[PDB]
């Protein structure tokens, strides 16, 4: 936004939050009535509410930067529910599991995350790893590199930055690591921006 | 703070009409939606500026109104809708009483 | 479920009770056509006492030189005495109210007295003595005709429908039917005389008062009737603080409608 | 055709506008809004007939706003053309295309198809013209057209016409 | 704010209905013959040759200005010049559709006179044809019964071939030399 | 972008006001950006409703490491009208 | 404010209720909705030409929504459309579907029952269609034969022939959200299909549907079955993008995903080597995500879970409860230009007065027109500003342009024009409107005169008590400012205190001397109680109302 | 005399508390239950079972199951309940809106 | 239908004015009033649109009549001239 009124370049203009409104500092006019609470409004896609009973938590988040845009819902025994129905609905979303190559590399994700439990890691790590590998996996740049010794890279690389310390040596053992190739990798992904 | 069913009674129960229109419309919601005179829908394009309406479906461009209803009920309107329900408003009568 | 259910309900501008269909639900709201705000528990005298008694306090016979009302109460007194013509009007007038007094004995067949009416008759006469300062010991210059075709157009002006057809014009006359009971008994010539001691220009404002009182007392289109029936029982259904079901756990069964109700008795006379 | 056609519209009032000049401002505002107007429904709105005879009724005053709205009985001549219409009027343009002929508040195209055979667009003419041995149709001619079609646009009616049938044309 | 008719019809939801106007009679839902005033009465359809047009919106303006000096207490080619007078008294001087609707039928109009345009209001009368037919009979020229009858296709059938031709013969008499 | 109407001069470089400022409501405490590009303004202001000194700033990290900063303010509430006891 | 429309301002008299045509739910459509995807033109900050906003409905701050533009707060949201690579049932009318297939014949189309029957002569007479419905269904969901041979109202001697066709009535049952039937040495068993039922339903006769309680034009049987689906626009199921690897999507849109990825599914398995039983499979699973978007909380079956065990919040479900769209949305609501605080009694203020603390006097706002009569009073309060207590804290112009007086420089300068408003303070003797909730009867709810005062605490008579049950013990009450002069005249008419004294709920005085009057009352009253001169001074001082007569 | 029944019973009520509501509250309650031939219950499947507006009826309890059946009846309201006034945002016709106020020229021009 | 307006002799309604036609005539008068309104009464110094509209009622000086709707869709047109002011 920006005054008509007046329109100096550097636009001097507040947020008067507890008055709902968006005003311009300079002159006084009020550009706009409508003004939402972030913070509140977030709160109906991520909240307390895990039981199902608060009418405000109507949403859900997700995470474009890793998931893609995947919306699911799964389908799952209620209050009141027949096995039966359960089973056969579950029984044709299998049929219905006809995912890309890529659509079942998320199963590479799979991998870190167990990977990333089991090396006593943080969320935030695998965050980073699974964005990284996300990245790189289809590159050129790495063409056939060792794909276990990829995606073992990837972990380094989200460790690197989630300020986690782990030695080379650490994720080398906990997965199998042929050093001048993990070594390699870890080289071409660094140098991938 | 809410305004509630109860309170509603209250206002219902006193004969302050206006006062209950205020407090449900002015004082909260209060929208303007343009409504199609052909189907009872807000399916009308209005482009204010231009001064251009139309509901294609109904291809009017002619028989168009302007309403002040609560949002919520625009909501609920358009939520009776995404459930195949036709909530058609209209602002003539056709029925005598 | 009460403010919900009579929600609709309003009073129309044909004194009549109807729902959001126009379906009628009572035909004269609250069965009299009157604002609840406006009404007062009043004495209806005439119901009780001896048939002794009663005669005492209403009859007035100028045919017979006991019963004539005494030249005490008007200057009228002395040429009053034998009046022919004027005891047939009185005669009409104590006829009337006992006819009043068999019918309200029928209406309340136990006795009960005081029953909420709307006007105060009793503070209009208290307040006719305040203002005109009546005297006690001087003898009124009201005429039986004054004071019996007073009361008798009084009634005639005490409109709660307007209406020129018949139907409507007996529903207004039903409507008045209790109220004018009252009026009768309290504005009886030998209680205004006797009692009363009231003046012509007193007298006068008497009924004046009651007039524009009775008027102001009677519903007004539009009021919600329906909500405040509905808040009205449901208000102290709340104070009521807990070998018959009794309270909020019966008010329960009697809403419901409840086939399976916990204390069925019959009470055999 | 040019009807007289009995129309009823609603002015909304502002209550500083509620004094003794109501009824002019009113009668006013129905010839601003009314007069000169053109609706696919109607047609050309024309003139208000008997000015001292308008209808003001009475004003429902809303209940947000202290402002009253009247629903004005007024009656008009209108002009409404239709398919099968044959009209006399006068040369208006004169294209390679064909001719626009207005016939009272509206003009009609008669495309240079709808056109008798040997009368034909002529440019060397002063202004170029329609040249048959017997006939030359300019920027200034009386000509007869039937119309042949209308096109509803709400501000203005366009119609398309044709001189080429017997009786039609120059007058 | 859009201007409304004098009769009521049912919302269907299907607008889809709305049929074509014609020399079949068939015009508008509004223009059809039977139609209503504005004090409910059921009057027939006012359609108008021009002449009777032109003195229409003529004495029209002219009670018009009356009112206006009112309020303000507290030849042909000669016409041309004089209507153009008086619409810069009585109209918003922006009514160019009114303003060419005048200089068109001051130029097109057959009879001049109130006097003239009643003579042909009486002998078309009695012919008892749709009224948007004796306006196109008084508003176009025609010599012969077939001229008339292919002009205005409506008829056909509705009048005799001579019977029409006197008629014509009669609206040629009473058109005004200007 | 989107910063609040309040006083953001209580905060040194930091981001952080030292203890023993008085603050007031409306006032920034904690100043935050969402950097996304150029960036937002996440900052943490005193409930409008209060007033009072700032107590105690501690500044450290989680177990997985995440910078995070908690501020202590105290308040004297003297006994008023609506009070309840 | 809103911009201004030519368009006539009217007021919605009736509503008429119906079901979508599937050719007008594609005919209202500004987008086909081909996609189970958001937004992220892959890997981007914008909306697919396939969900939310493929030509659709706008947000996040931008104009952009199909020439219309308007934007967020004048856009009322478009909606597009999904079209379905087989029927399946409303989840709603599952129950009615099945009451129609019992009234009607199979595969023929033709009512079971006639005129020439005596008890159904009697159900189609009447009047209110729905018990029509019941009465005409009672009676032919026994009827198991479609007669072609019926005996005349004559004698039955003679059988006068009526509809065709002679085949045997199936006994429906529901299993799941599937119908299925059984025609009668053992019976037939199998499963009616959403597509036979369709075809049955639109070869039902205008004059028999009518009967049934249809109507030709608004709701036919036919569309309580759903071909094509109306695509909610965003403002019915909100997005929100936050930082970039944090977006929050609607239930409603994660269901629309899956009624498409289904959709999407089955139309490549038709189209495809059919392989019958493989196809069945895919169209039960579009018939749940469908059933399961409108209403989630279906009895027998499993229900639509979000990753976090919460069950997706349905249409059905947020329309629902008290806190639902009706109840908590229209029939009551939060609102503007209200206040609550503690109350406290004050013996020094007078039964109508209402005690305001001046923070919330200075909060709470009055828009007072420009007349010639305010004109120099209203200068004054904008002059004071808002900071001071008499003042004001906005001035709004006639274009509708509200200008905050806490950044205007030349604020008491202000040239102020008749016609404009200027929000003030409220004052002393504003009326506003009281109450104590749970608001049980009209007098929960009364008209108060203004008193600006010290201290936060809402200040009150305490023969007023009575009425509000309220003890000051901590109890809060609220405060409602009319915004009109009309709004204001509805209070000091109607709702005032004094016009509550006397009650109507049981025609004597709801509001009576209570308390430390009550108590003293009597120890002043009794003839023990003698007054000497000093004191009987002071008394006949303290009533305002003294002759000064002593 | 089921009416006078049920009058009775509910006044013994309010009396048993040794409360007292005036007559006409509880006889319009009990005039309610009653009008329609037969005792109406004061729930969801008696007075709540009426033909009423849909957006009245669905206001109190049956909400959702009320409007898909008013869809599928294609029921009409005509907006006369204080109820879908209020949903719609509208001056209900009760008290201040039970009639219609106008501007009369001839008057106004007779006092100025 | 417009056939619904009932005549002025015919009418049957109270020649009281409701309380509600009193609070929404005033109201009505007074936001005309502080609209910039004419004023049918002089000011004997007045300022406030509500006791204005209160001298307007008070000196039966207000232009607005009272259509009161009826059941069934009728109804009856009464001036507050006319109507009589007890309350
Ligand atoms: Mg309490
Ligand atoms: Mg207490
Ligand atoms: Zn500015
Ligand atoms: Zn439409
Ligand atoms: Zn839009
Ligand atoms: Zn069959």
């Known amino acids: 936004l920006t005054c008509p009124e007046c329109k100096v370049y550097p636009p001097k203009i507040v947020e008067r939050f507890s008055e709902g409104d968006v005003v311009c500092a300079l002159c006084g006019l009020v550009l706009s009535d409508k003004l939402v609470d972030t913070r509140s409004e977030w709160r109906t896609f991520s909240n307390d509410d895990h039981n199902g009973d608060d009418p405000s938590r109507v949403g859900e988040a997700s995470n474009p930067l890793l998931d893609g845009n995947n919306l699911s819902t799964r389908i799952g025994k209620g209050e009141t529910t027949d096995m039966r129905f359960t089973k056969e609905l579950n029984k044709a979303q299998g049929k219905n599991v006809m995912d890309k190559k890529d659509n079942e590399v998320q199963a590479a994700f799979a991998k870190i995350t167990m990977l990333c439990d089991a090396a006593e890691l943080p969320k935030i790590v695998k965050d980073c790893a699974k964005e990284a590998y996300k990245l790189c996996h289809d590159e050129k740049t790495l063409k056939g590199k060792s794909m276990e010794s990829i995606m073992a890279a990837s972990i380094l690389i989200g460790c690197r930055r989630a300020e986690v310390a782990r030695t080379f040596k650490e994720i080398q053992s906990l997965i199998h690591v042929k050093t001048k190739e993990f070594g390699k990798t870890l080289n071409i992904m660094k140098n991938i921006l | 703070l809410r305004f509630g069913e109860m309170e509603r009674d209250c206002m219902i129960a006193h004969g302050a009409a206006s006062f209950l229109k205020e407090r449900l419309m002015e004082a909260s919601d209060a929208f303007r939606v343009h409504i199609c005179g052909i189907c009872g829908l807000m399916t009308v394009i209005a482009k204010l500026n231009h001064n251009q309406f139309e509901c294609k479906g109904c291809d009017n461009k002619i028989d168009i109104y302007q309403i002040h209803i609560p949002y919520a009920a625009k909501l609920l309107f358009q939520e009776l809708m995404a459930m195949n329900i036709t909530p058609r408003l209209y602002t003539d009568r056709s029925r005598d009483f | 479920r009460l403010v919900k259910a009579l929600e609709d309900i309003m009073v129309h501008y044909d004194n009549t009770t109807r729902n959001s269909l126009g379906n009628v639900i009572q035909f004269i709201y609250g069965e009299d056509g009157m604002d609840a705000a406006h009404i007062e528990k009043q004495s209806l005298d005439t119901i009780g006492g001896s048939d002794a008694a009663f005669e005492k306090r209403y009859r007035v016979d100028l045919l017979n030189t006991d019963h004539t009302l005494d030249p005490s109460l008007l200057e009228s007194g002395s040429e009053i005495l034998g009046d022919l013509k004027l005891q047939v009007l009185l005669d009409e007038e104590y006829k009337q109210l006992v006819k009043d007094r068999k019918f309200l004995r029928e209406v309340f067949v136990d006795g009960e007295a005081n029953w909420p009416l709307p006007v105060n008759i009793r503070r209009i006469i208290q307040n006719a003595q305040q203002t005109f300062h009546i005297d006690h010991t001087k003898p009124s210059d009201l005429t039986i005709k004054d004071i019996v075709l007073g009361v008798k157009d009084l009634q005639e002006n005490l409109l709660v429908l307007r209406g020129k057809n018949e139907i409507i014009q007996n529903a207004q006359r039903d409507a008045v039917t209790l109220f004018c009971c009252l009026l009768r008994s309290r504005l009886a010539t030998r209680r205004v005389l006797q009692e009363y001691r009231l003046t012509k220009q007193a007298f006068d404002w008497v009924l004046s008062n009651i007039e524009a009182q009775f008027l102001r007392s009677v519903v007004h289109p539009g009021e919600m ?28 069964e009697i809403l419901n409608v409840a086939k399976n109700m916990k204390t069925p008795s019959l009470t055999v006379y | 055709m040019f009807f007289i056609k009995d129309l009823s519209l609603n002015i909304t009032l502002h209550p500083s506008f509620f004094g003794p000049r109501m009824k002019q401002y009113l009668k006013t505002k129905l010839l601003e809004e009314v007069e000169g107007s053109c609706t696919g429904k109607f047609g050309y709105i024309l003139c208000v007939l008997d000015y001292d005879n308008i209808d003001i009724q009475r004003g429902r005053i809303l209940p947000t706003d202290g402002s009253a709205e009247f629903n004005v009985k007024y009656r008009a001549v209108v002009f409404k053309p239709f398919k099968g219409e044959v009209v006399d009027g006068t040369v208006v343009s004169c294209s390679q295309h064909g001719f626009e002929v207005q016939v009272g508040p509206m003009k009609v195209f008669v495309t240079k198809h709808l056109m008798p055979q040997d009368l034909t667009f002529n440019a060397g003419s002063n202004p170029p013209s329609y040249q048959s041995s017997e006939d030359v149709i300019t920027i200034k001619s009386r000509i007869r057209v039937k119309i042949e079609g209308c096109i509803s646009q709400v501000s203005s009616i366009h119609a398309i016409g044709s001189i080429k049938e017997d009786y039609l044309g120059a007058i | 704010v859009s201007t409304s008719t004098f009769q009521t019809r049912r919302r269907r939801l299907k607008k889809v209905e709305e049929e074509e106007n014609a020399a079949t009679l068939q015009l508008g839902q509004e223009f059809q013959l039977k139609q209503i005033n504005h004090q409910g009465e059921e009057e027939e359809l006012i359609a108008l040759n021009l002449s009777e047009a032109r003195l229409v919106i003529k004495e029209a303006l002219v009670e018009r200005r009356r009112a206006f000096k009112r309020s303000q207490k507290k030849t042909r080619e000669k016409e041309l010049e004089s209507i153009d007078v008086l619409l810069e008294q009585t109209t918003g001087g922006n009514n160019k559709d009114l303003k060419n609707t005048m200089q068109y039928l001051t130029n097109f109009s057959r009879f001049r006179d109130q006097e003239t345009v009643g003579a042909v209001i009486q002998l078309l009368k009695s012919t008892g044809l749709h009224p948007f037919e004796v306006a196109q009979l008084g508003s176009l020229a025609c010599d012969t019964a077939d001229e008339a009858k292919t002009l205005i296709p409506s008829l056909n059938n509705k009048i005799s071939d001579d019977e029409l031709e006197r008629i014509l013969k009669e609206l040629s008499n009473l058109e005004t030399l200007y | 972008l989107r910063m609040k109407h309040g006083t953001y001069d209580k905060l040194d470089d930091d981001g952080l006001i030292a203890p023993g400022v008085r603050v007031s409501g409306e006032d920034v405490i904690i100043g935050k950006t969402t950097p996304i590009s150029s960036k937002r303004d996440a900052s943490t202001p005193l409930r409008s409703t209060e007033n009072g000194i700032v107590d105690q700033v501690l500044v450290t990290t989680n177990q997985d490491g995440l910078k995070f900063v908690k501020v202590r303010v105290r308040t004297t509430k003297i006994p008023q009208i609506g009070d309840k006891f | 404010g809103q911009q201004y429309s030519s ?477 009109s002069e009309e709004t204001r005249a509805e209070l000091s008419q109607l709702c005032a205190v004094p016009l509550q004294i006397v009650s109507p709920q049981s025609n004597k005085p709801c509001m009576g001397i209570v308390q430390d009057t009550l108590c003293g009352i009597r120890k002043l009253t009794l003839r023990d109680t003698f007054i000497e001169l000093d004191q009987v001074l002071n008394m006949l001082y303290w009533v305002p109302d003294w002759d000064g007569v002593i | 005399a089921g009416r006078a029944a049920l009058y009775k019973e509910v006044y013994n009520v309010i009396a048993s508390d040794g409360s007292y509501v005036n007559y006409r509250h509880m006889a319009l309650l009990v005039d309610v239950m009653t009008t329609q031939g037969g005792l109406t219950s004061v729930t969801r499947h008696g007075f709540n079972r009426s033909n009423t507006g849909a957006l009245m009826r669905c206001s109190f309890e049956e909400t959702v199951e009320i409007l898909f059946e008013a869809g599928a009846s294609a029921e009409l309201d005509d907006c006369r309940g204080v109820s879908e006034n209020v949903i719609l945002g509208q001056m209900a016709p009760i008290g201040t809106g039970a009639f219609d106020v106008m501007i009369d020229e001839e008057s106004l021009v007779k006092y100025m | 239908l417009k056939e619904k307006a009932i005549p002025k002799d015919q009418r049957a309604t109270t020649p009281y004015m409701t309380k509600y036609e009193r609070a929404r005539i005033l109201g009505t008068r007074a936001l005309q009033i502080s609209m910039n309104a004419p004023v049918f009464v002089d000011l004997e110094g007045e300022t406030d649109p509500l006791r204005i509209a209160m001298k307007e009622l008070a000196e039966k000086k207000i232009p607005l009549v009272i259509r009161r709707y009826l059941p069934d869709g009728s109804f009856e047109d009464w001036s507050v001239e006319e109507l009589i002011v007890d309350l």
């Open chain 3, 225 to 252: 009737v329906g909500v405040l029936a509905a808040q009205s029982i449901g208000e102290p259904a709340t104070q009521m603080t807990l070998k018959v079901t009794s309270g909020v756990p019966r008010l329960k």
């Open chain 7, 7 to 483: 368009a006539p301002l009217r007021t919605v008299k009736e509503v008429q209720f119906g079901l979508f045509s599937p050719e007008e739910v594609r005919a209202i459509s500004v987008a086909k909705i081909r996609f189970p995807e958001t937004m992220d033109e892959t890997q981007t900050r914008a909306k697919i030409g396939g969900l939310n906003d493929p030509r659709l409905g706008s947000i996040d701050r931008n104009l952009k929504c199909q020439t219309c533009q308007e934007g967020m707060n004048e856009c009322p949201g478009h909606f597009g459309h999904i079209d379905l690579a087989k029927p399946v049932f409303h989840v709603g009318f599952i129950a009615k579907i099945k009451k129609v297939c019992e009234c009607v014949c199979m595969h023929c189309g033709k009512l079971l029952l006639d005129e020439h029957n005596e008890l159904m002569r009697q159900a189609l007479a009447i009047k209110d269609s729905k018990k029509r419905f019941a009465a005409i269904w009672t009676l032919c969901k026994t009827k198991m034969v479609c007669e072609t041979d019926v005996p005349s109202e004559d004698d039955p001697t003679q059988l006068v022939s009526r509809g065709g066709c002679g085949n045997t009535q199936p006994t429906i049952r529901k299993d799941g959200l599937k119908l299925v039937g059984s025609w009668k040495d053992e019976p037939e068993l199998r499963v009616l299909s959403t597509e036979e039922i369709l075809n049955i339903f639109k070869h039902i006769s205008v004059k028999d549907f009518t009967s049934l309680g249809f109507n030709e034009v608004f709701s036919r049987p036919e569309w309580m079955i759903l071909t094509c689906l109306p695509v909610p626009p965003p403002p019915v199921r909100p997005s929100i993008s936050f930082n970039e690897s944090q977006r929050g999507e609607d239930d409603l849109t994660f269901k629309l995903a899956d009624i498409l990825k289904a959709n999407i599914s089955l139309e490549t398995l038709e189209h495809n080597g059919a392989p019958h039983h493989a196809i069945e499979e895919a169209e039960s699973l579009l018939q749940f995500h469908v059933a399961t978007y409108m209403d989630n909380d279906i009895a027998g079956q499993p229900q639509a879970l979000q990753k976090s065990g919460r069950p997706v919040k349905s249409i059905r479900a947020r329309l629902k409860g008290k806190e639902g769209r009706i109840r908590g949305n229209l029939m009551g609501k939060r609102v503007d230009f209200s206040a609550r605080t503690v109350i406290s009694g004050d013996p020094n203020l007078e039964l109508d007065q209402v005690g305001v603390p001046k923070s919330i006097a200075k909060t709470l706002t009055y828009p007072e027109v420009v007349t010639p009569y305010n004109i120099d009073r209203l200068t004054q309060l904008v002059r004071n500003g808002p900071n001071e207590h008499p003042g004001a804290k906005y001035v709004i112009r006639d274009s509708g342009d509200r200008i905050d007086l806490r950044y205007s420089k030349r604020a008491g300068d202000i040239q102020l024009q008749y016609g404009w408003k200027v929000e003030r303070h409220i004052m002393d003797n504003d009326p506003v409107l009281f109450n104590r909730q749970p608001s049980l009867h009209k007098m929960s709810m009364m008209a108060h005169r203004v008193k600006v005062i010290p201290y936060s605490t809402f200040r009150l008579n305490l023969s007023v008590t009575s009425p509000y049950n309220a003890d000051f013990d901590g109890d809060e009450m609220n405060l409602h400012v009319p915004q």
